[PDB]
Structure formats: structure tokens, C-alpha cells
Amino acid sequence: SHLEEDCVHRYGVNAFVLYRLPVVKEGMVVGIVGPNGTGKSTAVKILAGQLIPNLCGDNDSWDGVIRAFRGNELQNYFEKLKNGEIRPVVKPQYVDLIPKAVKGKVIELLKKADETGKLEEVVKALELENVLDREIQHLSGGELQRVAIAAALLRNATFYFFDEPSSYLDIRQRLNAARAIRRLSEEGKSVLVVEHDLAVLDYLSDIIHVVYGEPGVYGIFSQPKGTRNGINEFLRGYLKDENVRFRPYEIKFTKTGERVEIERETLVTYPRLVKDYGSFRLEVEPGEIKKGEVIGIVGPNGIGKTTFVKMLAGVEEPTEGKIEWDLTVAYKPQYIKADYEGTVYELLSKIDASKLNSNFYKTELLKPLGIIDLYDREVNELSGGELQRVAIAATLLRDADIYLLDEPSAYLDVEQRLAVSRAIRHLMEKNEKTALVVEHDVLMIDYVSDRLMVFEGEPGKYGRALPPMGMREGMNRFLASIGITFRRDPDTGRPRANKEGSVKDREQKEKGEYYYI
Amino acid sequence: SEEEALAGLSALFG
Ligand SMILES: Nc1ncnc2c1ncn2[C@@H]1O[C@H](COP(=O)(O)OP(=O)(O)O)[C@@H](O)[C@H]1O
Numbered sequence: 090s091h092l093e094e095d096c097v098h099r100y101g102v103n104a105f106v107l108y109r110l111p112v113v114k115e116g117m118v119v120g121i122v123g124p125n126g127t128g129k130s131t132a133v134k135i136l137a138g139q140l141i142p143n144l145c146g147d148n149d150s151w152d153g154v155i156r157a158f159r160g161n162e163l164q165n166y167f168e169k170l171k172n173g174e175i176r177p178v179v180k181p182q183y184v185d186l187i188p189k190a191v192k193g194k195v196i197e198l199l200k201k202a203d204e205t206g207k208l209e210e211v212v213k214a215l216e217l218e219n220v221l222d223r224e225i226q227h228l229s230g231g232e233l234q235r236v237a238i239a240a241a242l243l244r245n246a247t248f249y250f251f252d253e254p255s256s257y258l259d260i261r262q263r264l265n266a267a268r269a270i271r272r273l274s275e276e277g278k279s280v281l282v283v284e285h286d287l288a289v290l291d292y293l294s295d296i297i298h299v300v301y302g303e304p305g306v307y308g309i310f311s312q313p314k315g316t317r318n319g320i321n322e323f324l325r326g327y328l329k330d331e332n333v334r335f336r337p338y339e340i341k342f343t344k345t346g347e348r349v350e351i352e353r354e355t356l357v358t359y360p361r362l363v364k365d366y367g368s369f370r371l372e373v374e375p376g377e378i379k380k381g382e383v384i385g386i387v388g389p390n391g392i393g394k395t396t397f398v399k400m401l402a403g404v405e406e407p408t409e410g411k412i413e414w415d416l417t418v419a420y421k422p423q424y425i426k427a428d429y430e431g432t433v434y435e436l437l438s439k440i441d442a443s444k445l446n447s448n449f450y451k452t453e454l455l456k457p458l459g460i461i462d463l464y465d466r467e468v469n470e471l472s473g474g475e476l477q478r479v480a481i482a483a484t485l486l487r488d489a490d491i492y493l494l495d496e497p498s499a500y501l502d503v504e505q506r507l508a509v510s511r512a513i514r515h516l517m518e519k520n521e522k523t524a525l526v527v528e529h530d531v532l533m534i535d536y537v538s539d540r541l542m543v544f545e546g547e548p549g550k551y552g553r554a555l556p557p558m559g560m561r562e563g564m565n566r567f568l569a570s571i572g573i574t575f576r577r578d579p580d581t582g583r584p585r586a587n588k589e590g591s592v593k594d595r596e597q598k599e600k601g602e603y604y605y606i
Numbered sequence: 607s608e609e610e611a612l613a614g615l616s617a618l619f620g
């Protein structure tokens with residue numbers, strides 16, 4: 090490792106160094122997974138032709154790159170790139186910035202991008218019908234993301250690169266987008282994709298690269314791996330052929346003998362609830378919450394998931410129905426704006442200083458979420474991802490009967506998501522407390538949950554919360570509405586997506602068994 | 607905000 094010939098790019102005002110690049114292949118989806126700050130987007134910019142790599146020296150031409158990749162399958166790729174025979178289509182990471190770069194209505198922009206005549210089909214697949222007449226200034230993060238994916242899908246090219254397409258998308262939208270993206274590979278096109286949602290990455294990919302190193306300092310692309318081996322090696326934290334142990338422990342999913350079936354005592358019940366906001370209505374079916382369980386909450390956005398959590402938190406009053414509880418609630422809101430003049434250490438030490446000094450909390454919460462490295466940071470200067478982790482930590486440090494975490498995966502990289510899953514679960518097991526977690530990341534839902542609460546309905550119009558039910562029944566119901574099936578992986582115990590049209594997918598769809606444990 | 611973005615995004619759309 091760290092070979093000079095493999096040194097692809099060094100940022101001058103930074104000194105971050107990237108080693109190696111992923112393979113791209115027509116008729117294949119190549120997936121890229123790794124912590125942020127390790128060069129994933131840098132690699133995409135290079136392969137797209139947007140950044141001429143300097144080879145960790147002073148190279149400033151494609152000729153120098155072509156020579157450096159002598160005897161590499163990428164040599165001819167870069168020749169074609171240099172000569173304009175190829176011009177990759179790039180759905181970039183920074184979809185937030187679309188309003189600053191582009192004006193006008195959405196329909197206008199997708200018309201321009203239409204080089205395939207599939208405007209209606211793409212608009213359908215990404216469910217953009219209600220967004221077509223909107224002006225870009227009035228689009229949500231999630232709508233900006235889907236308009237970007239749409240515009241990339243509509244271009245005619247050979248190479249299509251998608252940098253973090255699941256960001257801002259609900260569970261339905263990310264899985265639908267993955268299906269639509271993968272269809273490019275069935276047409277003989279090449280797809281490169283960077284993803285932090287491991288279920289989506291799995292479903293998307295034929296080949297996987299793991300990116301490893303030290304965020305902000307250096308990153309290295311693994312050798313190409315099969316999808317199963319790659320993700321399994323990522324979870325184990327050890328790349329065998331490269332002989333690199335990049336995490337000192339394994340991230341394990343539940344194998345079928347681990348968690349004892351327990352008939353839990355009821356903590357609280359709630360009756361039928363209704364919450365109206367003008368023309369929107371949420372109806373919640375009567376349900377029960379057990380002592381010491383975690384309920385995962387899943388569904389499309391615009392449906393009342395947050396609204397439900399807010400009623401549980403006592404920050405919102407139901408329109409109809411009555412919550413009669415004598416419980417303490419700790420609440421991690423979906424959207425947080427820092428308004429705190431002090432450091433992370435000050436904030437968390439004032440919640441529970443004894444827990445900050447506890448070995449269990451250091452091991453299971455503070456170290457894995459990277460909170461200790463944030464201790465002397467001002468809370469008001471934290472980024473989205475930093476503030477998310479601190480808020481989760483702050484919530485889990487409180488002493489409560491019930492912990493409510495609304496979309497903790499937002500702004501988190503793959504490594505941080507796995508850490509957050511483990512922390513929620515281990516802390517709730519340790520302290521014998523109860524949690525509800527709203528999440529769109531399927532592997533997070535699978536790791537944290539004992540039972541599942543499904544929301545269904547029409548975004549912005551109506552929503553219905555089903556009573557909490559078993560993992561199998563819950564996921565079957567949800568996944569039926571998307572038409573995607575998952576099996577279990579014997580090695581890691583992780584849910585493993587069946588690709589569209591595969592034999593296991595057919596067998597499962599006929600039996601109506603969309604999800605195994 | 608970086609002018610790298612306005613280039614990247616306009617290419618996808620424009
Ligand atoms: N234009 C740039 N100038 C200087 N440094 C940069 C630039 N772009 C990225 N970097 C640095 O390189 C590292 C890797 O960036 P990036 O490829 O965006 O990582 P990833 O996409 O894996 O999060 C980051 O820590 C970042 O600070």
C-alpha cells in the first residue's frame with residue numbers, strides 16, 4: 090500500500106492524497122463505499138474529466154495520466170476521455186447548490202436534458218409529476234435530488250456517475266431510484282455509484298470498491314470485489330487480498346440464535362389518534378409499546394411519521410384522541426438548528442458528566458460516533474453531520490423512559506450509520522429502556538428494531554400509522570408496495586437485496602415473502 | 607458555493 094505509482098491526486102492547500110481509482114465497465118454497476126473525506130467524489134471528478142489529476146506531483150494534462158496508467162484497463166478509458174469519445178454524465182453530490190446554478194421551472198430543465206425521449210417514463214419512476222411546474226427555488230432537498238437523478242437518466246451517453254443519490258430521499262424514493270439507475274446497465278451502459286445506504290448499494294451493484302484511510306489525510310481504493318464479498322468485508326473491517334484491517338472490530342448483524350424471544354411487559358398503550366393540518370390528516374391505529382423494545386418506524390415522507398413522534402414527545406397535541414402517560418421522554422428531532430454558545434463538551438457534560446466518564450459510554454457511544462474528537466468544537470460551528478451525531482449522543486445520554494430518534498442517518502456516512510445503529514441498540518439493551526426510531530436506511534432499521542411500525546398513504550394528503558407489528562409482517566407489507574425483496578446473508582446475517590428479475594426475487598414474490606430474518 | 611459546482615450542475619441540466 091501507499092505506492093508512488095498508485096498516487097493519483099494530492100490537494101495542495103490540504104495535502105489530502107488519493108491512491109488508486111475504481112474500475113468502470115459497460116454493462117456493469119460499480120459501487121463505491123467508504124467514510125467521508127477519503128476521496129470518493131475526487132475519484133468521480135477525475136473519471137468524469139472535471140479534474141485532471143496531478144499524480145501527486147505537478148501533472149496538468151491527460152497525456153501524463155495516460156502514461157501513468159500504462160498497462161491498466163483505465164489507460165484506454167482516459168485516452169477516450171482526452172479525445173472526447175466519452176463524456177460521462179455526472180449526478181453530483183452537491184444537489185443543494187442546484188438553485189444557485191440553474192433557474193426556471195423543472196419541466197423546462199428536464200426537457201433540455203431529454204436526449205432519449207423517456208421524459209414521461211423517468212418522471213414516473215421518480216414520481217416527479219407534482220414537481221414539474223414548480224420553480225427550482227421552491228424545491229425541497231429531496232426534490233432537487235430526484236430532478237438531478239432524472240436529468241442524468243435522460244441524457245444519452247455511455248458512462249453515468251451518481252455521487253450519493255440516496256441523500257434526502259425517503260425509503261421508497263431511494264429504492265425506486267436505485268432500480269431506475271440500475272436499468273442503465275441492462276442497456277449496456279456503464280454506471281459508477283457512491284452510496285452510504287448499504288441496502289441501496291447492495292441492490293445497485295455488481296462490483297464493489299471499499300475506500301479506506303484517514304478522513305482528510307488520505308484515501309485508498311480497494312481492489313474490485315464482488316458485491317457480496319465487498320460489503321461483507323466492509324462489515325468485518327478487513328480486506329483479505331489487500332490485507333488491510335481498517336476497523337479494529339467487526340460490525341455484526343444478528344444471526345438467528347442471538348436475540349431471545351421475550352414476551353415483554355407493556356410499557357404504555359395509546360388509543361386511536363388523529364392529527365389534522367388543514368387538508369392533511371394523519372390517523373394512527375391503536376397500539377402498544379413494550380418495556381425494553383425498539384420500534385422502527387418506516388414509510389414515505391409527507392405521511393405523518395414526525396407528526397406521530399411529536400405527539401409522543403408531547404410537543405404536539407392530537408386533534409382527536411388522548412395520550413395519558415407519566416413517562417419521561419428524550420427526543421432527537423429530525424431537523425436541528427444549533428443555537429448554543431458553548432462547546433460540545435460543555436453541552437454533553439451538563440447533561441450527564443458521569444456518563445461521559447463511563448467506560449461503557451466511551452466504548453459504545455462517544456468513541457464510535459466520534460464525539461470525543463468534537464469535544465472542544467463550538468456547537469454553533471458544527472456541520473450537519475457533526476451536529477447530527479452530537480444530538481444523538483445528547484439524546485442517548487439523557488435519563489428517560491423512552492427515546493425518540495427521528496431520522497438519525499441524515500447527513501451521516503456509512504461508517505457513522507453503523508456506529509449509530511450499534512449505539513442505539515447497545516445503550517437500550519444496557520439500560521433496559523424503550524426507543525422508537527424513524528429511519529429510511531434499511532440496514533439501520535434491521536439492526537435496531539424488535540418490532541416495526543409502518544406508515545402508508547399519500548404524501549401531503551393523508552397518512553395512516555399501522556399498529557406496531559413483527560419485523561417480517563412489517564417489512565412484507567412495506568416492500569410489497571415497492572416490489573423489492575430481501576433475503577438473509579448467512580455469513581454476516583445482513584439483509585441482502587435480490588436484484589430485479591433474479592431467481593430468488595421471483596420465488597419470493599410468488600410466495601409473497603419479501604423479507605427474511 | 608464553489609464555482610466548480612455551477613459548472614458541474616449546468617453541464618447536467620443546460
Ligand atoms: N477542491 C479541493 N481543494 C482542496 N481540498 C479538497 C478539495 N476537494 C476535496 N478536498 C479534500 O479531499 C478530501 C476528500 O474529499 P472527497 O473526495 O470529496 O471525499 P468524499 O467524497 O469521500 O467525502 C476531503 O477531506 C477534502 O477536504
Ligand SMILES: Nc1ncnc2c1ncn2[C@@H]1O[C@H](COP(=O)(O)OP(=O)(O)O)[C@@H](O)[C@H]1O
Binds near residue numbers: 367
Ligand atoms: N405544523 C404544521 N402545520 C401544517 N402542516 C404540517 C405541520 N407539520 C407537518 N405538516 C404537514 O403534515 C404532513 C406530515 O408531515 P410529517 O409528519 O413531517 O411527515 P414525515 O415525517 O412522514 O415526512 C406533511 O404534508 C407536512 O407538510
Ligand SMILES: [Mg+2]
Binds near residue numbers: 130182252
Ligand atoms: Mg463525496
Ligand SMILES: [Mg+2]
Binds near residue numbers: 394396423
Ligand atoms: Mg419526518
